[PDB]
Chains A and B, each alone.
Chain A
């Protein structure tokens, strides 16, 4: 079963370096080409680089030539994007995708992306607060940098009727979002309701009860 998992993104200072890795599984990268496609926040897809691991031949987009270098380790079945001399414009979700096969040059399989954030500011963990209460309740995740944060409810057992909101950047330079859920009000007081906030940029975990 074909799969691609990227890793290595996060926060980096302007001018600094970073290297993402695409772990391919269920197939050999020597049989096809491997691409990096990226997407700035709220924008479209931008093809960035391609490699043929059989012989290491590479190709690059104009916007990244001379800074990014794509490579492959066929023994580890992995591809890599080495990003040097980064700029704020490079901030984006970086996707790794493959071409289907020998005579199939559409990108059939994609990994789900690692977000690279280019900014001088530094990592700060979230403050988690409760939004106390058919009723609605939630958690307010408050003042963190950079993104992402992932919020679940009852360790993943509760999903129906949950809205985790897109983060808003405030004038302070920090982010904050809100996660809500609707419940039938016969159930509060009987059932635990506990939000699981995860901000792995700062290795912060909070289970906050409401």
Chain B
């Protein structure tokens, strides 16, 4: 049983930059090495077979090289569509074994999010639950901090966030934060504020509605 140890487990490089992914075999695996690309929720796709041969249909900015037990995938001109997890594989012995993968994220210019807030819909409010929703749209970088203040009162652990995976053409993110209260707790107050700090807004941005 031969192991493939991949490094690094994640990297952040800019558009047009030269990216090197390394994968080391535990023994001699000769040239029986393949590199696959996988985008989220999608089947992996063959990029390189037999260590340094480019599979047909794949852009020529993808190369593979070999140095003993060291196998190197190179992307010579990183494009936004190259956001993916990349996997190495040995098929010198049975069983074939994959590497742990390398997540590639594109680093781009700062982008300010567009903030939107939606109040709970009548339909849902008659069912005893109320979910306020906040949305940051098309921002970079990753990290923002949203907090809720009902009537300028901070909240804790009544709220969840979900972040989309990086957009394949402009390299930004979108974020959702949805606060959950029940009918009663929701009726008790008037103004609902969802507010976030991000590296692209000089001032932390306030969006809120009055019930």
Contact = CB atoms under 8 A, between A and B. Distances in A.
Interface of A: 35, 37, 44-47, 50, 59, 61, 95, 97, 100, 104-108, 110-113, 127, 129-132, 136-138, 140, 142, 163, 165-168, 170, 176-178, 180, 182
Given A47-B95, A107-B46, A180-B174, A142 B137 contact: no
Given A129-B124, A130-B123, A165-B162, A105 B91 contact: yes
Interface stretch (B15-23, B97-105, B144-152, B192-200): B97-105
Contacts of B74: none
B164 A127 contact: no
Contact of A127 (B91, B124, B133, B162): B124
B153 interface: no
B127 A167 contact: no
30 contacts: A37-B44, A37-B98, A44-B87, A44-B98, A44-B99, A44-B100, A45-B98, A45-B101, A47-B95, A47-B96, A47-B98, A50-B94, A59-B94, A95-B43, A97-B44, A106-B49, A106-B55, A110-B44, A127-B124, A129-B120, A129-B123, A132-B118, A140-B121, A163-B164, A165-B163, A168-B160, A170-B180, A176-B131, A176-B178, A180-B116
B91 A140 contact: no
A95 B36 CA distance: 14
Contacts of B180: 170
A163 B176 CA distance: 10
Given A113-B43, A177-B162, A140 B133 contact: yes
B32 interface: yes
B85 to A, nearest CB: 8
6 nearest interchain CB pairs? A110-B43, A106-B34, A106-B49, A131-B118, A45-B98, A136-B116
Contacts of A97: 43-44
B72 interface: no
A59 B95 contact: yes
B43 A104 contact: no
B84 interface: no
A50 B114 CA distance: 49
B133 A131 contact: yes
B5 to A, nearest CB: 12
A138 B87 CA distance: 35
B133 A163 contact: no
Identify whether the interface residues of B are mostly helix, strand, loop, or mixed: strand
A102 to B, nearest CB: 14
B25 interface: no
Contact of A180 (B49, B135, B163): B135
A163 B95 CA distance: 39
B190 interface: no
A48 to B, nearest CB: 9
A166 B164 contact: yes
Contacts of A178: 133, 135, 162, 176, 178
A107 B164 contact: no
**Most chain A C-beta atoms within 10 Å of own C-beta, residue among B46, B87, B176, B178:** B176
A177 B160 CA distance: 11
Contacts of A136: 114, 116, 135, 137
Contacts of A165: 162-164, 174, 176
A106 B176 contact: no
B98 A138 contact: no
Contacts of B137: 136, 163, 180, 182
B131 A107 contact: no
Interface in B147-191: 160-165, 174, 176, 178, 180
